[PDB]
Amino acid sequence: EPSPYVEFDRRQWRALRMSTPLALTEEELVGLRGLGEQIDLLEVEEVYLPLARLIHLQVAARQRLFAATAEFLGEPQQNPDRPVPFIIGVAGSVAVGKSTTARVLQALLARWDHHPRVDLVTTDGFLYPNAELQRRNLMHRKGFPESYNRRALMRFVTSVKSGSDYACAPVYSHLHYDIIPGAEQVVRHPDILILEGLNVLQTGPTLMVSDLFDFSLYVDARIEDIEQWYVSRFLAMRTTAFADPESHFHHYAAFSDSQAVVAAREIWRTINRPNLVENILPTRPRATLVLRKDADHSINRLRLRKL
Amino acid sequence: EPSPYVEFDRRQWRALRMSTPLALTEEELVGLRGLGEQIDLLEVEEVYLPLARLIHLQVAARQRLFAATAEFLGEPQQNPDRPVPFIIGVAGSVAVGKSTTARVLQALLARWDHHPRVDLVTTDGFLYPNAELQRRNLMHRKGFPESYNRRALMRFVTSVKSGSDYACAPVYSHLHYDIIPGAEQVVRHPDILILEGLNVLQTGPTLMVSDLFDFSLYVDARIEDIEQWYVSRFLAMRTTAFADPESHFHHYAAFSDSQAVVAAREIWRTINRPNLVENILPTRPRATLVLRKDADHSINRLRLRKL
Ligand SMILES: Nc1ncnc2c1ncn2[C@@H]1O[C@H](COP(=O)(O)OP(=O)(O)O)[C@@H](O)[C@H]1O
Ligand SMILES: Nc1ncnc2c1ncn2[C@@H]1O[C@H](COP(=O)(O)OP(=O)(O)O)[C@@H](O)[C@H]1O
Numbered sequence: 167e168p169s170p171y172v173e174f175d176r177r178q179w180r181a182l183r184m185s186t187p188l189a190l191t192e193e194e195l196v197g198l199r200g201l202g203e204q205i206d207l208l209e210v211e212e213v214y215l216p217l218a219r220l221i222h223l224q225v226a227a228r229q230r231l232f233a234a235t236a237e238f239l240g241e242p243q244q245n246p247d248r249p250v251p252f253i254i255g256v257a258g259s260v261a262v263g264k265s266t267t268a269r270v271l272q273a274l275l276a277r278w279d280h281h282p283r284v285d286l287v288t289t290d291g292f293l294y295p296n297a298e299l300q301r302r303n304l305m306h307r308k309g310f311p312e313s314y315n316r317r318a319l320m321r322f323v324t325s326v327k328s329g330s331d332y333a334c335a336p337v338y339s340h341l342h343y344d345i346i347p348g349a350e351q352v353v354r355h356p357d358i359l360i361l362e363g364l365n366v367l368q369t370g371p372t373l374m375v376s377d378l379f380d381f382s383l384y385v386d387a388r389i390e391d392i393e394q395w396y397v398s399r400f401l402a403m404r405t406t407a408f409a410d411p412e413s414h415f416h417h418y419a420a421f422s423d424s425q426a427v428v429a430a431r432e433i434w435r436t437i438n439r440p441n442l443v444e445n446i447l448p449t450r451p452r453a454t455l456v457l458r459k460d461a462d463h464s465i466n467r468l469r470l471r472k473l
Numbered sequence: 474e475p476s477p478y479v480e481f482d483r484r485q486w487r488a489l490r491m492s493t494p495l496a497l498t499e500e501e502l503v504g505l506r507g508l509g510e511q512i513d514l515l516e517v518e519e520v521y522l523p524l525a526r527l528i529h530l531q532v533a534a535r536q537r538l539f540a541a542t543a544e545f546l547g548e549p550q551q552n553p554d555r556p557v558p559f560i561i562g563v564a565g566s567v568a569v570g571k572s573t574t575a576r577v578l579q580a581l582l583a584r585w586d587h588h589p590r591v592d593l594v595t596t597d598g599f600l601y602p603n604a605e606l607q608r609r610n611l612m613h614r615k616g617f618p619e620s621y622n623r624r625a626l627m628r629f630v631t632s633v634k635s636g637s638d639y640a641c642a643p644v645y646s647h648l649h650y651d652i653i654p655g656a657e658q659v660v661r662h663p664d665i666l667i668l669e670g671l672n673v674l675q676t677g678p679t680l681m682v683s684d685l686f687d688f689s690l691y692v693d694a695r696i697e698d699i700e701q702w703y704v705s706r707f708l709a710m711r712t713t714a715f716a717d718p719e720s721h722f723h724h725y726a727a728f729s730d731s732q733a734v735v736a737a738r739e740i741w742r743t744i745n746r747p748n749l750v751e752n753i754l755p756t757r758p759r760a761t762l763v764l765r766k767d768a769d770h771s772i773n774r775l776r777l778r779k780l
Contacts, residue, residue: 167628168635170680172546182545220545227541234534235779238489238527239479321474327780328475369676371755373477378780448678472542473634473685 170473176466180212186219189277190270198269201406202399204463205266210274213465217455218274221381225252225358228380251327252358253378255366257449258385259442260309261396267385267457268362275358282357289363290338292319295345309364309441316365316374323375326359340407343414364441367449376452384453389442391461393434400430477780483773487519493526496584497577505576508713509706511770512573517581520772524762525581528688532559532665535687558634559665560685562673564756565692566749567616568703574692574764575669582665589664596670597645599626602652616671616748623672623681630682633666647714650721671748674756683759691760696749698768700741707737 188211199205232250236243244250256268268286276284292314299305304313318336325333337349353359367376367384376382387395401423408419421429450456458467495518506512539557543550551557563575575593583591599621606612611620625643632640644656660666674683674691683689694702708730715726728736757763765774 168632168637170631170635170685182547220542223541223545224538227537230534230537231531232779234530235527235777238530240489324477324780325475328477330475371758373758377759378477451678451680452684470542472539473631 170471172470172472174468174470176212176468179216179468182216182219183211184219186215188215190273194273195270198266198273200263200266201402202261202395202463203263203266205263205270209465210270213457213468214270214274218271218278220455221252221254221275222278224381228252248329248355249357250329251356252380253323253327254358254360255376255379255382256360256362256385257364257367257382257446257453259387259389259392259446260364260438261399262385262387262392263459263463264362264364264385267383268360271383272358272360283354284358284360285353285356286360286362287322287335287351287353288338289314289319289361289365290340291336291345291351292316292322292363293338293345296343306437307441309437311365311368311445314365320373320375323359323361323378326353326356327378329355331355341410341413364446367452368445369449369452376449379454382452382454384450384456385459386450386456387459387463388461389439391459392442393431393439394461395463396434396438397427397430400433401426477778479777479779481775481777483519483775486523486775489523489526490518491526493522495522497580501580502577505573505580507570507573508709509568509702509770510570510573512570512577516772517577520764520775521577521581525578525585527762528559528561528582529585531688535559555636555662556664557636558663559687560630560634561665561667562683562686562689563667563669563692564671564674564689564753564760566694566696566699566753567671567745568706569692569694569699570766570770571669571671571692574690575667578690579665579667590661591665591667592660592663593667593669594629594642594658594660595645596621596626596668596672597647598643598652598658599623599629599670600645600652603650613744614748616744618672618675618752621672627680627682630666630668630685633660633663634685636662638662648717648720671753674759675752676756676759683756686761689759689761691757691763692766693757693763694766694770695768696746698766699749700738700746701768702770703741703745704734704737707740708733 190210192207195207195210229249256264258264272284272286276282293308294313294315296305299313307313322333322335332352332354334350334352337346337351339346361375367382368374369376404419404421404426407413408415410416418426454471456469457465460466497517499514502514502517536556563571565571579591579593583589600615601620601622603612606620614620629640629642639659639661641657641659644653644658646653668682674689675681676683711726711728711733714720715722717723725733761778763776764772767773
């Protein structure tokens with residue numbers, strides 16, 4: 167049976183790296199890694215390089231696509247000092263590693279000849295303020311489609327891929343568990359925009375942000391494993407993030423391994439799991455590339471969309 | 474506010490025709506026109522030519538896209554005696570003109586230097602047999618997403634765009650209002666495949682046929698007008714299609730203008746309208762191009778997806 171997909175194992179995927187140079191150090195990789203993530207330079211070599219490659223092969227092949235339409239419209243022939251931004255989406259569950267995969271990818275792509283302006287934006291800042299969520303009875307649905315100002319998010323990405331000089335996005339504080347008043351992330355006509363979020367790959371009755379993606383990644387892993395990663399990380403934050411008195415979850419810092427496991431599991435059970443199952447996972451089929459990780463966090467398989 | 478779209482009026486759209494030659498006659502155009510459709514060579518000049526153009530500009534620009542991926546995969550460099558088929562979807566309501574728009578488009582594209590194999594397939598043949606519909610209680614939902622073997626449809630298009638030598642699709646009889654036993658439409662590695670259907674542009678929890686489209690058309694028009702076209706055509710068929718004794722609707726042939734209007738309106742009210750509103754119209758936002766028709770069936774406006 168023919169397929170739109172083609173899968174790989176790490177063995178065969180790494181062979182597609184070719185001369186693709188490794189331009190990241192260990193000190194560097196580290197400041198990109200998130201708590202609990204196991205990524206090392208090796209993985210960046212056998213997985214992220216063949217990927218950085220693919221992406222570059224398509225950045226050019228994609229500019230052709232907006233050209234034709236421009237040629238068709240008898241329009242000028244756009245200056246390469248400002249071509250059409252290449253949008254990349256990185257999706258996946260809470261605690262799966264999106265943040266790291268996205269951070270690393272941006273590091274690699276920025277370190278490409280010419281030094282392309284590679285901006286990274288998370289959908290966090292597009293969450294409705296806690297006050298607005300309290301108003302809609304969603305304080306326990308943070309992460310669900312409805313907890314996002316999807317209208318603003320679309321306005322943002324649209325603005326950037328449509329050639330705007332600069333666009334603004336709100337900023338989210340993980341420390342305060344809310345949107346930061348008066349804060350803004352400014353994106354000035356980047357060459358590449360990486361949008362990271364749980365939702366990003368979603369589709370609906372209206373043109374959405376996933377409809378503006380030129381390439382997209384979906385970081386996958388077995389669900390019982392993501393819960394483990396999730397819980398585990400929760401316990402580990404008692405001494406990192408939760409340790410801070412200014413933290414909205416400072417009260418978890420004192421929990422015992424036992425109590426902490428209980429609380430972690432309940433959040434997983436009542437928020438992140440349902441969301442993963444009802445909204446995220448059903449978007450995986452549309453991902454250009456899927457990075458499958460084993461219980462140890464290692465990416466040992468991949469599924470590519472050839473069609 | 475920036476937009477992914479750009480609109481036109483017929484004035485400005487026609488200017489994008491350029492040297493694009495008209496290779497269709499009046500005798501020809503006619504055998505492509507459906508009952509009630511008003512299309513003439515003029516419309517084919519000021520609307521369908523600028524379109525045939527756009528499409529050609531992108532057929533090339535799109536082959537680049539599968540190349541890059543092929544180059545990336547260290548794969549051969551595919552023979553132009555069999556490149557990757559360009560898929561085009563034509564969507565819209567019952568009685569809006571899809572069939573004609575699709576037929577005409579195919580005629581124009583086949584009459585392009587080199588004479589590219591341009592196949593046209595309607596999703597009609599992918600409806601479940603009346604018996605299977607009776608089994609599922611859907612005999613009054615013909616046209617709704619669930620009344621289609623969407624699995625087979627996906628298998629079909631996937632097979633064709635994935636380079637298969639030939640793929641088969643069932644055939645639907647409008648005379649018998651059901652699937653024809655043992656009938657098959659065979660498609661052999663066409664250069665272009667046009668898939669026409671109400672549903673085609675749909676999206677969901679699984680990779681769908683709309684995810685394989687390289688370009689897509691959505692024939693639009695005001696809903697009160699489509700009902701008029703629908704009813705009107707219903708009355709007109711009393712002496713054409715319904716006149717045949719072998720017709721599943723031969724009993725409508727004897728209705729009076731009055732009774733016929735009543736029956737036509739009830740079908741519209743209970744089947745086609747709800748479907749248009751709940752399933753088709755919500756897909757219009759994703760269409761590469763939208764052909765807006767006025768009450769007189771004339772296409773006087775267009776909305777193009779530049780992003
Ligand atoms: N409560 C928290 N306080 C501070 N930082 C957090 C908190 N929760 C998650 N983070 C960090 O912010 C990011 C959240 O990632 P998550 O939202 O878990 O998606 P993913 O792990 O796939 O990137 C990660 O860097 C995570 O370590
Ligand atoms: N009951 C019928 N019997 C025979 N032909 C029909 C019947 N209903 C529709 N047709 C024809 O088959 C096609 C049906 O088109 P429809 O399904 O109405 O979509 P559209 O008009 O947009 O192409 C048109 O050619 C129409 O004229």
